[PDB]
RNA sequence: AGCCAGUGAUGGCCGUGUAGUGGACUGCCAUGGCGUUGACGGGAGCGGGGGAUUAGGGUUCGAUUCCGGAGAGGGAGCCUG
RNA sequence: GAUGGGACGUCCAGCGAAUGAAUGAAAUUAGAACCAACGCCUCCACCCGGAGGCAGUAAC
RNA sequence: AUGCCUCAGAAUCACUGCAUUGCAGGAAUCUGCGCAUGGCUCAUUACAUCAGACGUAAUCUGCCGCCAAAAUUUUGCGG
């Protein structure tokens, strides 16, 4: 069933090799999820969402710069027109 | 560089809908203070002039964030001196008289 | 009650398929005079790159010429040549002739040569043999055509 | 196989060109799709540089645009009535670009009722929608030919996509002098 | 000393095919396009940077190291990319 | 009853591809008067209703 | 005469060396990339190829550089 230990149920095969004690061979278990792998998966999403957020910040600063320049140009034009009106 | 806001006696109401509110219901909002002219500006905000500079200070208090037909009624203090508006008005009347 | 009904021209619509410009919609009546000539008709025209002026015939005409430099999607880029009109027999095409002198080094003298080129001519121009024309390079338009007439002098 | 080079052609002088080198894959052509009209069927083709072209075989529906109103609807094609290449294409019912076809007019009738309130369910509408209808109808005018066709149940259109290259049969309704030009031929 | 058009020859119109332009290709229309400033046909030959001979002008060679093209007995077709 | 103002809910609203519509600027002349509604400024201390005019004014 | 393994895709060789249910090296196979380059020759070839000057607004482009990314009702338990 789910959430059950599997690391010791894997069988081991004994190889009787001459000149030494018998070697015991056990396969490497695939798709074993630990806490370090869980943290590794969860870091990708949070890193990605920070990148799109800092790109929105960069866009906002550019828009503010464009708007400020156009505000100054309008203010200069109004001052010229205002001076012309009062000089009449 | 003194703050130009204190001692103003002029208030600013942010969410006021002139198409569904009328001036009578606007004036009711403040009942214990004498009310001067009221202005609305189609961007949903309004300006209210008060008689005494000692007023509008506790009106800014205990009214920011309170409910007024919804919309939470953000309110602050504005320069908008009544005396300078009167001089602008009489200059405009003089200027229009010269033009016509 | 109902919108007015236009009529076919009958002087330019003499083919099996309806002739139209692909850049504008002649059935759209808009409040902006983006593409409108002096007569009020909807007509697309543009300015080609170099110091060449769009003829008034192109702006105020009624032909179609999907191969025209001024009223279509043909773009002028490359090299500019001049020549003399040689023959105007084909439909919307003419042959120009270029005459030049070639230098032979051994004899220190010149000899005469020539070359014939076939180009596309818009209806806004009406060249005759003996005339002088200026042509500009464009994308391949036929088996042998690589140039378009830009100005008749 | 099929090639698209100028090596097999005569020179302008009329002489014959002596061919050296063989045929290159970069200049191949392919057999035409010859799209008919029927239930949908497509065939992928792997083109140069990867990428897939879609061959149209027996298409029967598409998106058709009402240019004057700047809208479009999904409609079913009924038949082919004209072709500027040859009558053989009309006889064999082949869908190509610029073919003149007819469509069922049901989607366009439904859109007109819900946008202008004119039926060629309307009376069950909100008051603010009814007010909006009056504005739209105040300075909008339909034309004779379009209104007659919508009442009848079919209207003419021309194919704008290339069915053999994209596997889609899209088009635009005929209006203006173009409608008159093709009505006179169809007589 | 004339060449090119049934079966594309030169141009036009709507299309198809292509990664894309184009008689590249299907249908229809007109009679055009090239040539004694040597077309069409025939002979020798991979093109160039360069080598040899040097009063100067020239004559002649370049299969071969670098650049470009083509081919893998002949000739045709194609899959994967 | 208002192309009236705010909520509420119910379908769409990512890159790329297909068709249709709009945008992808302007650069050949100077002052006035009425009516529609839109924006502002003055009254009659405000409100009520019932008056009269363009000081200013990127847009929303 | 064209193959390629790093600390970093996949070993239970019934493979080897030390330990004693492990640590290393790892034959073979699957997977990813390359084999359209280099080398050879000069048969064909005169509006062809090539050279000097220009174009692609008529297009395709793996490896390499600088960059971008807010679509999507999934899983477990009790029904
Ligand atoms: K064409
Ligand atoms: K590959
Ligand atoms: Mg030879
Ligand atoms: Mg050589
Ligand atoms: Mg030899
Ligand atoms: Mg040698
Ligand atoms: Mg050798
Ligand atoms: Mg080869
Ligand atoms: Mg041999
Ligand atoms: Mg290793
Ligand atoms: Mg492999
Ligand atoms: Mg090679
Ligand atoms: Mg070169
Ligand atoms: Mg999401
Ligand atoms: Na794993
Ligand atoms: Na030679
Ligand atoms: Na080579």
Short mmCIF file of C-alpha atoms (C1' of nucleotides) in Angstrom, two decimals, chain F:
data_model
loop_
_atom_site.label_atom_id
_atom_site.label_comp_id
_atom_site.label_asym_id
_atom_site.label_seq_id
_atom_site.Cartn_x
_atom_site.Cartn_y
_atom_site.Cartn_z
"C1'" G F 1 -39.21 54.54 -19.22
"C1'" A F 2 -33.06 56.29 -19.17
"C1'" U F 3 -26.98 53.69 -25.44
"C1'" G F 4 -28.17 56.21 -16.17
"C1'" G F 5 -24.46 54.78 -11.96
"C1'" G F 6 -22.73 50.79 -8.71
"C1'" A F 7 -22.73 45.50 -6.99
"C1'" C F 8 -23.98 40.35 -7.67
"C1'" G F 9 -23.35 35.73 -11.31
"C1'" U F 10 -22.12 33.35 -16.12
"C1'" C F 11 -19.52 32.43 -20.57
"C1'" C F 12 -14.80 33.94 -22.98
"C1'" A F 13 -10.01 36.56 -22.26
"C1'" G F 14 -1.75 32.61 -22.19
"C1'" C F 15 2.59 31.76 -26.55
"C1'" G F 16 2.19 29.99 -31.83
"C1'" A F 17 -1.03 29.13 -36.30
"C1'" A F 18 -5.73 30.27 -39.96
"C1'" U F 19 -9.63 34.01 -41.96
"C1'" G F 20 -12.01 38.90 -41.61
"C1'" A F 21 -12.21 44.36 -39.30
"C1'" A F 22 -9.47 48.68 -36.95
"C1'" U F 23 -4.56 51.09 -35.66
"C1'" G F 24 0.57 51.32 -37.98
"C1'" A F 25 0.17 60.06 -37.72
"C1'" A F 26 0.48 65.22 -39.40
"C1'" A F 27 2.91 68.81 -42.11
"C1'" U F 28 -1.64 74.54 -48.50
"C1'" U F 29 -6.49 80.23 -44.35
"C1'" A F 30 -8.31 83.16 -40.43
"C1'" G F 31 -12.86 85.12 -37.13
"C1'" A F 32 -18.20 84.48 -35.55
"C1'" A F 33 -23.80 82.76 -34.41
"C1'" C F 34 -27.60 79.14 -33.09
"C1'" C F 35 -29.28 73.55 -31.01
"C1'" A F 36 -28.29 68.53 -28.66
"C1'" A F 37 -25.57 66.80 -24.33
"C1'" C F 38 -20.70 66.78 -22.11
"C1'" G F 39 -17.24 69.27 -18.91
"C1'" C F 40 -16.34 73.52 -15.57
"C1'" C F 41 -17.21 78.49 -13.01
"C1'" U F 42 -20.64 81.88 -10.38
"C1'" C F 43 -25.36 82.92 -7.48
"C1'" C F 44 -29.77 83.07 -4.08
"C1'" A F 45 -25.03 81.40 3.65
"C1'" C F 46 -25.56 75.25 2.34
"C1'" C F 47 -30.20 71.74 0.94
"C1'" C F 48 -34.59 72.39 -1.61
"C1'" G F 49 -35.62 74.65 -7.15
"C1'" G F 50 -34.27 77.91 -10.50
"C1'" A F 51 -31.19 80.88 -12.41
"C1'" G F 52 -26.46 82.68 -16.07
"C1'" G F 53 -21.56 82.21 -18.79
"C1'" C F 54 -16.79 80.38 -20.75
"C1'" A F 55 -11.28 81.88 -16.26
"C1'" G F 56 -8.89 77.76 -16.90
"C1'" U F 57 -8.64 72.56 -18.97
"C1'" A F 58 -3.12 65.65 -21.89
"C1'" A F 59 -6.49 61.75 -21.50
"C1'" C F 60 -9.78 58.40 -18.36
#
